[PDB]
């Protein structure tokens, strides 16, 4: 009944784990990074990293490890998902195609038992004789790794302990040995066992049971020369190996906690350690040589090494370059020096990697007043927390825009000898060519008396060797520039008007009638060299330097009008090489072949907007990949701009979209402009990196920003942002943030770092007089701050200090009552460490004047303020399982009217028309009606069978949507039945779905300009952005049929069936998908190969790729 759709906007960015080893070959050094559901592979070079492969799994990755069984060159990978899918995979590079096969499969789920804290742990034998797993408490799963057992059969072993923290297999033992740390009454211990897979029981470890300091959570297994283990905690680094015992207690640790490690020395002499707030460490293992026995160590030494972000995963790579893996902030790549610079730091960074992190809140804001808003989020954390301005497409920066009608061509020229940046531009209206002169910001007209002024030409610019070119239907001619006059004249010896020509930088190719004249532009004179009539008509040409040649192109390309085809053909003698046919019949209007990387591309832009591809190489020119794609309706020309050393081509279509190649694939990033026709570069001194461009009636020039689809501009604040609001008439933003602060011995607390929270241009402090009622000498406290940020320059114009320790929760800007003024309104809650439930809060309303910040009214509120929204002209709030409505009087006051206190922890809240959806923490969605006549709340419908919601919104006036903490979606619906006595307070779950992620905020709006109904965006903890919309009957039925015919055949990496994962799940309750369409699958239809699409349903293929296309652009 309820027909919906969910798709991906931006893949997650947080990093959950990273390891190194040997996938690509035995002599490569790989870096493996695991996202939420994404795996990516990096191989090491001398300057940094490089990507090779990207894969997605139908499950949440929880275990990732490398191992080397006997009798093969490289390692093997073991992965265990969140629904306990167990797999063995490995790396196959066969030719150029890369694929990863499943040399095993299985499911290790049980019937009775409880998933526990600390999640899943997966370890592997140093001799690779089994694989251990902790899944449920008190029960340890062992996988045998004999040559048989393709199905990953397992077996169970009972444990005398139920609470396991960490587990690793020891080094240099006779038979597979386990040593691990567990939790029980009377502290935590480390204690060891021996397995016997023949008789399936734990026998005895090599040494006895001892004790460890109360909060160790981190175990390192020492390699062969020393053996034993390293135990890391707070004020403890320890070594155990049989009987020998040693430890150190460095005084540095007190303030911060260690997180990750990676062994630096294969021998095991130095170690890397990652801190909870940035300082990377180094640990020292000092060894002695016995006179006759094996090596042994004396002691342990630490040293403060440098500064980094917060680390989640940490790997010493080699030669003093180290990856820092961050989940709460930007990850970076670091170089360690041999000599410490000033302040004594060895660290030098080379790259940084952006991470939206936990998207706490967001709003949709439209800056430049067009029909396209942009999203601003509250990203990052304690020391990296910033503001991100996520913009779809690149923003233009216009300088000289004039409404100039349609322009066929527009060229530059150089009026001086071959000096620096050009000084002239050449126009061309509908049927002639006009020459300008560009002496600065002004525009002027001056016709040179050496050119034509009444008839259109194809080429006007220069190639080389102090001369000018004249390419025309009526004549071909060359121009001398010192006289600025004419040197010679030529005409076509057929009196026939040319169709098209071609020349970029060294030679002209002109195509007349069925034949084609040729001459490369010689100094001061010209002679025919090459000539060959084409069997059928010629439509387009392309001549360009492709590499080690100063303009002279060995090859030539030819386009065709009626039945589109490319012909690889030599320039010098115009001999045929190959024939290759292309689809469609609609008319082309340009083709280009251009270099970006070692794999050359030729790109043809067709008349429907569809952009097609054939392959070209200078030596032979065999056909590379091929795929049917479409675009905007208006016909398209591609011609190239200059951006970088690997600069790329632009295009003209319905709406300008610049294609970009990142590693080897073409990215389809758009840009914010209405329509375009034609281009050329301008590199003036005052216009350093601009482009001259023609439109239907407009001229646009500007500057070029980034290349990939999403523009992020990081604005550092050193602030932990919470929520954000807009107030347009005030020409600014309102942002909440909150600061890390330690109490000093003097009672008062000063600071830890300089922050915008205290570095405000002007500041003010809350001055309440209604709170009146213990902090220690050294401890952590938290201070909260309102930030007004200039909407144009993104600088802190002002910052307001809330009271000490007031934990501010909510923000809104609206007009209330009959007041014409716009305000900033905050709901807060004085949180206490000792108690457990907020008893109070204030509702402060702010006037932000010309440059000052005023305060109006307080009206203390008897509890926390989880959510608010202006109802119609009233103020609707949610306070501690209550919902309330408020009125704005004329005398600048606020009064209560009607209450409702049946719920428990009514937290999320949305309104539509005259109905209220109150989301809940634990019970369910629930609906209210505001009844105007006598004026209070009256329940319409509810929902039983409780769920733990994490976001709630109103899709339409009749169905309702929520999201819950077990990573699932569901669209509720009203039941249309009679007997309205009790079952009309019952709402109907109609859709079921396993999203896989945690949803933090829902918002109406769309990140696109100005097939389905409704539009919604949400942001997740892992930094993903998702979108949901409703559907009608026909596309739903079609697409679910297609979903069956696609998930029946598609191969998961662990060959899990696609139905199982997308299926709804919960601790207590599980059913397959219904009511929903999966965008992940549907837009995954495009990576499928052409033949295998004819073994797709085969009532055709194009009719459905058009469907997936139209559903794609909604995000």
């Amino acid at each position: 009944m309820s027909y919906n759709y969910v798709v991906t906007a931006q893949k997650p960015t947080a990093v959950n784990g990273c390891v190194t080893g040997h996938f690509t070959s035995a002599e490569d050094l790989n870096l493996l990074i695991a996202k939420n559901t994404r795996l990516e592979i990096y191989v090491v070079t001398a300057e940094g990293l490089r990507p090779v492969k990207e894969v997605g799994m139908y499950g949440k990755i929880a275990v990732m490890e490398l191992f080397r069984p006997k009798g093969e060159s490289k390692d093997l990978l073991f992965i265990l998902t969140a629904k306990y899918n167990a797999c063995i995979l490995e790396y196959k590079q066969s030719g150029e195609s890369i694929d990863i096969i499943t040399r095993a499969h299985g499911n290790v789920q049980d019937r009775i038992g409880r998933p526990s804290e600390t999640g899943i742990i997966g370890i592997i034998d140093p001799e690779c004789r089994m694989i251990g797993l902790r899944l449920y408490d008190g029960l340890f799963k062992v996988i045998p790794l004999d040559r048989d057992n393709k199905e990953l059969k397992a077996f169970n072993i009972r444990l005398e302990e139920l609470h396991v923290i960490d587990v690793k297999f020891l080094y240099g033992c006779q038979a597979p040995t386990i040593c691990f740390v567990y939790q029980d009454p009377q502290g935590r211990h480390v204690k060891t066992y021996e397995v016997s897979l023949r008789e399936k029981e734990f026998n005895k470890g090599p040494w006895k049971q001892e004790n460890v300091e109360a909060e160790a959570s981190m175990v390192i297994a020492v390699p062969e020369p020393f053996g034993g283990a390293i135990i890391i905690g707070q004020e403890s680094i320890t070594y155990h190996n049989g009987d020998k015992y040693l430890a150190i207690a460095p005084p540095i640790i007190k303030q911060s906690t260690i997180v990750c490690h990676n062994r630096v020395d294969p021998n095991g002499s130095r170690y890397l350690l990652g801190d909870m707030e940035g300082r990377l460490f180094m640990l020292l293992l000092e060894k002695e040589e016995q006179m006759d026995g094996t090596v042994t160590l004396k002691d342990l030494r630490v040293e403060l090494l440098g500064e980094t972000s917060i680390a989640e995963c940490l790997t010493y790579l080699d030669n003093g370059v180290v990856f820092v893996g961050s989940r709460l902030g930007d990850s970076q790549l670091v170089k360690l020096n041999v000599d410490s610079n000033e302040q004594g730091s060895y660290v030098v960074a080379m790259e940084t990697f952006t991470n939206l992190g936990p998207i706490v809140d967001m709003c949709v804001v439209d800056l430049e007043r067009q029909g396209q808003g942009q999203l601003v989020t509250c990203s990052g954390a304690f020391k990296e927390g910033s503001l991100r301005i996520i913009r779809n497409g690149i923003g233009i920066h216009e300088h000289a825009s004039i409404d100039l009608p349609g322009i066929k061509g527009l060229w530059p020229l150089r009026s001086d000898p071959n000096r620096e940046t050009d000084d002239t531009l050449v126009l061309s209206f509908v049927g002639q060519t006009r020459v300008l002169m560009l002496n600065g910001e002004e525009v002027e007209e001056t016709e040179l008396m050496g050119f034509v002024d009444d008839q259109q030409t194809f080429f006007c610019g220069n190639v080389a060797h102090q001369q000018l070119i004249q390419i025309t239907s009526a004549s071909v001619r060359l121009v001398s520039q010192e006289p600025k006059a004419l040197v010679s004249e030529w005409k076509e010896p057929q009196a026939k008007n040319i169709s098209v020509a071609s020349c970029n930088s060294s030679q002209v190719v002109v195509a007349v009638g069925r034949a084609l004249y040729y001459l490369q532009i010689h100094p001061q004179e010209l002679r025919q060299i090459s000539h060959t009539e084409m069997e059928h008509e010629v439509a387009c040409l392309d001549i360009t330097p492709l590499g080690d040649s100063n303009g002279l192109s060995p090859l030539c390309a030819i386009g065709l009008w009626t039945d589109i085809s490319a012909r690889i053909l030599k320039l010098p003698s115009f001999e045929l090489l190959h024939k290759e046919m292309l689809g469609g019949e609609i008319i082309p209007r340009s083709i280009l072949m251009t270099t970006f990387e070692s794999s050359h591309y030729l790109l043809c832009a067709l008349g429907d907007g569809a952009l097609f591809y054939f392959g070209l190489n200078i030596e032979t020119g065999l056909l590379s990949d091929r795929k049917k794609v479409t675009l905007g309706t208006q016909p398209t020309v591609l011609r190239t701009f200059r951006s970088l050393s690997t600069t790329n081509v632009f295009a003209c279509s319905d709406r300008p979209t610049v294609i970009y190649s990142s590693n080897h694939k073409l990215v389809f990033s758009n840009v914010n402009l209405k329509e375009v026709n034609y281009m050329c570069p301008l590199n003036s001194d005052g216009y350093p990196d601009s482009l001259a461009l023609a439109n239907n009636s407009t001229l646009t020039i500007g500057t070029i920003d980034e290349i990939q689809k999403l523009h992020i501009r990081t604005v550092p604040l050193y602030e932990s942002p919470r929520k954000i609001c807009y107030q347009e008439v005030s020409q600014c933003f309102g942002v909440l943030s909150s600061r890390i602060e330690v109490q000093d011995t003097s009672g008062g607390t000063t600071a830890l770092r300089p922050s915008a929270s205290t570095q405000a241009l002007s500041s003010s402090v809350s001055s309440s007089k209604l709170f009146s009622s213990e902090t220690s000498f050294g401890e952590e406290v938290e201070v909260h701050n309102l930030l007004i940020i200039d909407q144009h320059t993104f600088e802190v114009l002002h910052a307001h200090q809330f009271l000490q320790n007031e934990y501010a929760l909510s923000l809104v800007s609206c007009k209330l009552g009959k007041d014409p003024n716009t305000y900033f309104i905050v709901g807060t809650a004085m949180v206490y460490p000792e108690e457990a439930e907020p008893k109070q809060g204030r509702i402060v309303v702010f006037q932000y004047s010309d440059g000052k910040l005023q305060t109006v009214a307080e009206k203390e509120v008897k509890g926390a303020v989880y959510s608010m929204v202006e109802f119609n002209g009233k103020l609707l709030a949610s306070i501690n399982s209550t919902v309330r409505l408020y009125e704005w009087t004329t005398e600048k006051e606020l009064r209560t009217e009607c209450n409702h206190y049946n719920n428990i922890m009514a937290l999320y809240l949305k309104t539509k028309g005259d109905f209220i959806l109150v989301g809940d923490l634990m019970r369910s969605v629930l609906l209210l009606a505001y009844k105007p006549m006598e004026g209070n709340f009256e329940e319409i419908a509810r929902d039983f069978n409780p769920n733990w919601m994490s976001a709630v919104e109103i899709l339409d006036d009749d169905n309702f949507l929520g999201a819950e903490n077990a990573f699932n979606l569901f669209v509720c619906q009203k039941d249309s039945a009679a007997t309205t006595d009790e079952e009309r307070q019952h709402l109907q779950e109609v859709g079921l779905f396993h999203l896989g992620e945690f949803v933090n905020v829902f918002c109406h709006g769309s990140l696109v300009m100005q097939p389905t109904q409704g539009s919604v965006l949400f942001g997740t903890v892992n930094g993903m952005i998702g979108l949901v919309t409703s559907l009608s009957e026909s596309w739903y039925n079609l697409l679910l049929d297609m979903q069956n015919r696609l998930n029946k055949v598609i191969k998961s990496v662990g060959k899990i069936e696609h139905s199982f994962w997308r299926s709804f799940h919960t601790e207590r309750k599980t059913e397959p998908a219904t009511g929903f369409i999966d965008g992940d699958l549907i837009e995954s239809f495009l990576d499928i190969s052409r033949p295998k699409m004819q073994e797709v349903v085969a009532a055709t293929a194009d009719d459905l790729i058009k469907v997936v296309e139209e559903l794609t652009r909604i995000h």
Binding site: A14, E117, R327, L328, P358, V360, A381, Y807, L809, A829, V831, P833, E835, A836, E837, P838, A864, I904, L921, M922, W948, N965, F998, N1000, V1021, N1022
Partner: peptide, 26 residues
Amino acid sequence: QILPKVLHKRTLGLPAMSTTDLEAYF
């Protein structure tokens, strides 16, 4: 065990207290 910042941790993705604990507490 204090609600506002345990929900804050859940928003940030830090290990929050288990839902069964809230079930017992509610």
